[PDB]
């Protein structure tokens, strides 16, 4: 034969099914008390402008 070497190993389906089942309990959102900071300020020698 003349082809690329591919290891034809057999996995176990039970762990794959268990992982698929466990993937359904994940949460895409999150719950926070305060929102993240979205603005900051830099001061200079001036007293009237930043």
């Amino acid at each position: 034969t003349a082809t690329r070497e591919v290891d034809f190993t057999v996995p176990d389906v039970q762990k794959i099914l268990d992982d698929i089942k466990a993937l359904a309990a994940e949460q895409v959102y999150k719950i926070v008390k305060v929102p993240s900071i979205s603005f900051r300020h830099i001061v200079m020698q001036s007293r009237d402008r930043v």
Binding site: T1, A2, T3, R4
Partner: protein, 50 residues
């Protein structure tokens, strides 16, 4: 005297001017195998005896 082009002085601009043969190649994702020895794989059938 030999009527052949063994050695020729060639400019750099015409180095790639000898590309005129059509080549066919097979994909690396397909396999090529020889099945000549598969022609002798067989079994005989014995006649029943009493």
């Amino acid at each position: 005297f030999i009527n052949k082009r063994i050695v020729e002085r060639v400019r750099v601009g015409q180095i790639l001017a000898v590309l005129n043969r059509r080549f066919v190649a097979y994909k690396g994702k397909m396999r090529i195998m020889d099945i000549t020895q598969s022609l002798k794989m067989g079994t005989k059938l014995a006649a029943p005896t009493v």
